[PDB]
Design a protein around this ligand. Structure first.
Ligand SMILES: Cc1cccc(O)c1
Ligand SMILES: Cc1cccc(O)c1
Ligand SMILES: Cc1cccc(O)c1
Ligand SMILES: Cc1cccc(O)c1
Ligand SMILES: Cc1cccc(O)c1
Ligand SMILES: Cc1cccc(O)c1
Ligand SMILES: [Cl-]
Ligand SMILES: [Zn+2]
Ligand SMILES: [Zn+2]
Lengths: 21, 30, 29, 21, 30, 21, 29, 21, 29, 21, 30, 21
């Protein structure tokens, strides 16, 4: 999930847009 | 774009900015 | 189009506190 | 939506919790 | 409402939102 | 105090309103 | 009533930095 | 109060430190 | 002079995310 | 500058990345 | 003024406030 | 640098204005 990927690890911009609509 | 842990509110606002008009969906912990 | 974008930054941020885990959806239109 | 209802006039936490989940 | 440590500024803004028109009082560390 | 209760521990909404006026 | 509420979010937040421990009071009226 | 004085026009940190304590 | 100061708080904050390490400059005039 | 261009109308992340470095 | 670690965004906004009209310059990590 | 001085250590107001323009 967003959080497990980008908080307890670091996230690219790209990896972050997966969570857009 | 930053190489940082993003957590909590800092995550939401960042998505806010990353998605723009598309918008988004936060589930918090999955 | 700023004062509804700058405003949504305050809203998104407040939804995060109030819903916490439940989560939310931020889109319209 | 929320923008029309919370940006024009203030919402309270209680109202904002209508846009949850 | 979240189950989180709230710290520093994140505490103040949250109280800001939790109290609304009553307002509030932050002492920082007691 | 607010901080010792809701930063170095977690706080309910209820526990947070104690600190309203 | 937004632009004085959204504004107070920026104020409360800045008081926190400037007073730090001393603390503050945020109410009126 | 602060809202009338800091929201209309900008306060500096110095002015804001008048509403401390 | 608020709505361009309150606005710059949202801008400065967003530059931080977008540039990260590269860094930035925030001044004018 | 940025204030005139991002405060009047919204900038996207992409536009904001013009004021970097 | 606070005696705190200031990090990340919390650093930028604080400088934002500390400099005012002078403005500023953030390099992130040096 | 700003960050090494005021994040991985604590910074005075004074120590912070060094980083103004
Ligand atoms: C109200 C609205 C419009 C467009 C995008 C959004 O995320 C929200
Ligand atoms: C907390 C908050 C922020 C922005 C708009 C609102 O109506 C309420
Ligand atoms: C100025 C004002 C009015 C009402 C509540 C507050 O916290 C502050
Ligand atoms: C830093 C700050 C925020 C909001 C209003 C002000 O006058 C100053
Ligand atoms: C646009 C502008 C004017 C004055 C100071 C600043 O940091 C930015
Ligand atoms: C993200 C953001 C904040 C403030 C103004 C803008 O144009 C964009
Ligand atoms: Cl943090
Ligand atoms: Zn704002
Ligand atoms: Zn933070």
């Amino acid at each position: 999930g967003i959080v497990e990927q980008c908080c307890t690890s670091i996230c690219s911009l790209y990896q972050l847009e997966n969570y857009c609509n | 774009f930053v190489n940082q842990h993003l957590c909590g509110s800092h995550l939401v606002e960042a998505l806010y900015l990353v998605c723009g008009e598309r918008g988004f969906f936060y589930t918090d912990k999955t």
